[PDB]
């Protein structure tokens with residue numbers, strides 16, 4: 001029972017679902033935010049009855065500010081924000097439309113901005129020695145064919161992590177980033193080249209599990225990581241050189 | 243006389259002006275693109291009479307495609323694109339409006355996208371073993387207080403460099419990035435803390451010169467750098483650890 | 485009943501690692517170089533701790549100890565290569581002897597310990613852990629530390645090479661790089677205030693137990709998909 | 725009349741650096757270790773070239789040579805620390821002697837040459853250049869190269885430390901890290917096709933002259949604001 005409040009965007013499926021389950025297990029009050037799938041959210045809240053869930057498009061800043069203000073009033077503060085929501089719109093760069101660029105930009109970048117602005121304003125005004133953990137990707141670090149738009153936003157996320165870490169370090173807020181490689185989710189379940197990935201590209205020869213990303217995020221949110229800030233930790237079975 | 247064609251966006255002032263002058267000296271036909279200052283462009287073209295100049299907002303994809311198609315018809319191809327145009331809209335993150343985010347995103351990211359898409363389509367279709375050089379910033383690499391939006395776009399630029407390098411490597415197109423630290427321009431001429439920067443933060447104890455960035459960009463565009471691709475080279479007097 | 489070996493495990497960061505792994509249920513063996521009194525005082529606090537005086541740059545004495553440890557406990561699950569020395573000074577005033585002394589411990593000590601332990605981990609099919617301690621000095625360079633920063637960059641490189649070489653065996657190999665940590669290695673500094681005020685965004689030195697917490701995480705089964713990485717714990721001081 | 729010293733300057737990448745700096749108007753001194761025939765054949769091609777046989781791990785012989793060079797030409801403007809060896813093999817089969825041999829040349833050779841040259845550059849107020857050759861093996865790790873990758877990571881770290889230490893003197897110190905370059909060091913590989921097909925996006929090895937072009941740029945007055953950096957020339961093979 002940590003007596004702490006955490007927001008996990010994209011917190012009902014995939015990596016976000018595992019992060020939610022891990023912080024819940026550690027005794028956080030968790031608020032999980034999602035975009036469309038009411039069924040997954042309700043099913044997750046039936047499994048974890050103390051969880052709050054909200055359908056909220058994080059690219060809509062006015063709805064984000066309203067939701068963060070609501071959460072702040074019910075639980076007296078915000079101790080941890082995990083910016084995990086994200087989308088992909090793959091395609092070769094020469095066939096990738098403006099719309100695929102702006103859709104991914106508006107969620108992976110502007111959604112992190114909306115949540116982080118609203119939450120950090122509260123942490124600063126109340127002098128909460130809080131935590132922000134962003135989820136990026138090896139794609140943003142090393143590049144990935146067919147992912148110019150995704151990789152761009154994930155590189156932006158790492159840079160925002162470092163800038164904000166410097167801006168809020170004097171307020172005792174740490175701001176870090178976690179960059180997974182290939183994780184067994186649905187975002188990677190439609191791949192057919194999984195065997196070539198494991199056999200040739202990943203030294204540990206397997207995909208990561210959602211729970212393994214959650215364990216790292218939970219370490220960074222805990223009081224055992226207060227001297228770590230501005231860092232990008234890569235969880236990828238050894239796949240890339242950071 | 244290189245008998246090559248180069249486009250330099252933001253090519254009439256500051257770093258872009260120096261890049262223009264250096265490629266012109268090396269015998270490129272240079273097309274310099276700018277945003278508003280007709281006087282600077284005309285004055286630069288009076289100094290370099292073989293230079294082409296165009297007032298073109300690179301965030302406007304239809305005007306970009308029209309201009310790139312024009313340049314392609316007049317000079318039979320494009321050998322080198324330098325994506326140098328960029329803006330800053332500084333402010334502390336908690337007071338930085340959506341508009342400051344989207345203005346910087348639309349030029350530093352979407353402007354690079356529009357130019358690179360139009361130019362790379364031509365290089366691929368004609369099998370030109372061409373060059374793209376993007377201009378980023380130490381701000382994107384290490385973060386900078388008051389520059390969440392700028393730093394985000396400059397990190398995105400580095401990630402796009404790596405993705406596109408991988409996508410076009412088989413076509414013999416190299417795609418690299420140059421990240422200056424503090425360069426003596428007008429973008430840094432309004433600073434009052436310049437002495438503290440030089441005395442304490444920069445080991446070489448001076449700002450860089452525009453021509454020094456241009457010399458690096460010109461090396462990367464030359465035939466002496468065809469085995470370098472996907473890299474980010476930092477020119478900063480030693481200021482940061484990459 | 486997992487077995488951990490912590491070199492330099494009786495003072496400073498190593499002591500805190502020993503204490504943390506002890507608290508987490510490991511059988512811990514702490515190796516030290518010369519200070520018998522500190523070692524015995526720690527064994528007083530932690531009665532189940534084994535302590536051995538061993539110069540890790542002596543390959544034969546290292547092999548003897550690792551083989552004895554392995555015979556006694558039936559395996560080795562975790563090696564923390566923490567022992568390290570500094571011999572600082574301007575490059576132009578830094579003798580060959582200051583280079584070789586720091587190389588022989590910070591590089592060859594890691595090599596000797598890791599050769600002995602990994603051979604056993606691989607022979608016994610142990611999905612073990614090696615965690616090496618480097619430094620931000622090796623990542624970003626540091627005036628007056630050409631020799632120290634050389635070996636700490638070497639340690640990071642060795643971590644990455646060994647992670648690739650032993651991945652198929654399920655042995656992860658990671659590195660922790662601290663910034664300024666409050667220990668004896670840093671008690672003599674005169675510029676502590678200026679480092680805190682100007683160089684460290686969090687405006688304080690780290691504590692040894694904060695390094696131990698990160699080491700303990702990497703050693704646990706909650707970190708099995710992290711390998712070959714160097715994680716910096718430095719209050720924001722450097723860009724990795 | 726600038727003076728450049730290129731260690732290992734008679735074969736492979738070093739030969740191409742010697743040739744490039746010669747073409748650029750330097751007085752070049754090429755240092756080599758044992759192959760007199762190759763050295764004389766290069767001096768035949770480049771009549772103004774000085775060549776010396778010198779084991780750079782011997783500090784006294786290095787000091788003798790640098791002091792002679794300096795007396796003859798009145799200064800030293802550029803040192804390229806290019807000499808290097810590999811003694812590859814699995815970590816568990818890599819003797820102490822393979823570690824020390826590679827350390828003594830790849831680390832201590834750089835140290836001995838750089839101590840001698842930087843002392844003179846600083847004494848004479850020369851705004852000189854040191855360029856060190858590392859490797860992607862040191863950046864990202866490489867199976868079978870624990871010792872080589874150790875020293876190449878050390879070289880990168882030393883570059884950064886020396887860049888900070890000598891910046892106030894106007895001496896820039898940079899590192900070039902090649903990927904796979906067509907030389908004798910790589911002629912014996914059997915997996916060349918698979919490396920080209922799968923690991924190198926540009927699908928070819930680099931040429932020695934492409935490394936020399938980058939070295940020559942860093943040595944020129946067009947690179948005076950670049951210091952402490954490691955520039956990778958590798959066809960896209962790794963992420964830095």
Ligand SMILES: NC(=O)C1=CN([C@@H]2O[C@H](COP(=O)(O)OP(=O)(O)OC[C@H]3O[C@@H](n4cnc5c(N)ncnc54)[C@H](OP(=O)(O)O)[C@@H]3O)[C@@H](O)[C@H]2O)C=CC1
Nearest residue numbers: 010014015034035036037057058084085086137183185187
């Ligand atoms: N999976 C992998 O292999 C890798 C993942 N990552 C990162 O991991 C994170 C999570 O990935 P993963 O678990 O696979 O993703 P999933 O696609 O499985 O889940 C995405 C979640 O984001 C929510 N979401 C999407 N758009 C919005 C929006 N506009 N506003 C609010 N919520 C939104 C979804 O809501 P809903 O359920 O209603 O649709 C869902 O809960 C991402 O940020 C991704 O970039 C990074 C590298 C690799």
Ligand SMILES: NC(=O)C1=CN([C@@H]2O[C@H](COP(=O)(O)OP(=O)(O)OC[C@H]3O[C@@H](n4cnc5c(N)ncnc54)[C@H](OP(=O)(O)O)[C@@H]3O)[C@@H](O)[C@H]2O)C=CC1
Nearest residue numbers: 252256257276277278279299300326327328379425427429
């Ligand atoms: N200067 C420095 O210290 C640093 C610079 N950089 C990078 O260097 C690059 C150049 O910097 P610097 O020379 O100082 O910049 P300047 O502000 O001096 O020049 C910017 C140029 O960009 C053009 N431009 C701006 N917006 C657009 C647009 N929408 N479409 C087309 N052209 C446009 C301007 O046109 P016009 O002249 O008509 O206004 C001008 O020519 C930037 O990308 C910047 O991020 C990176 C790190 C530090």
Ligand SMILES: NC(=O)C1=CN([C@@H]2O[C@H](COP(=O)(O)OP(=O)(O)OC[C@H]3O[C@@H](n4cnc5c(N)ncnc54)[C@H](OP(=O)(O)O)[C@@H]3O)[C@@H](O)[C@H]2O)C=CC1
Nearest residue numbers: 492496497516517518519539540566567568619665667669
């Ligand atoms: N403290 C800091 O700020 C930073 C530390 N580090 C790294 O952290 C590690 C620990 O540093 P710190 O705790 O400050 O060091 P201390 O000097 O406080 O402790 C060093 C320990 O290493 C042991 N040791 C030294 N040489 C040998 C040897 N040849 N064989 C066996 N044991 C040996 C010592 O034995 P004995 O007790 O008998 O002397 C002692 O237990 C080092 O690797 C260091 O480089 C990295 C960055 C910053």
Ligand SMILES: NC(=O)C1=CN([C@@H]2O[C@H](COP(=O)(O)OP(=O)(O)OC[C@H]3O[C@@H](n4cnc5c(N)ncnc54)[C@H](OP(=O)(O)O)[C@@H]3O)[C@@H](O)[C@H]2O)C=CC1
Nearest residue numbers: 732736737756757758759779780806807808859905907909
């Ligand atoms: N080739 C590649 O693919 C890569 C190379 N590198 C680096 O590039 C550099 C050159 O490599 P490469 O050209 O392939 O090497 P070569 O083996 O082809 O050439 C080595 C040169 O170093 C000289 N040398 C060796 N030991 C000594 C010594 N103790 N004292 C003086 N000179 C010595 C040799 O002298 P002699 O001629 O008498 O034998 C020779 O001139 C090295 O630092 C290497 O690590 C890095 C990454 C990849």
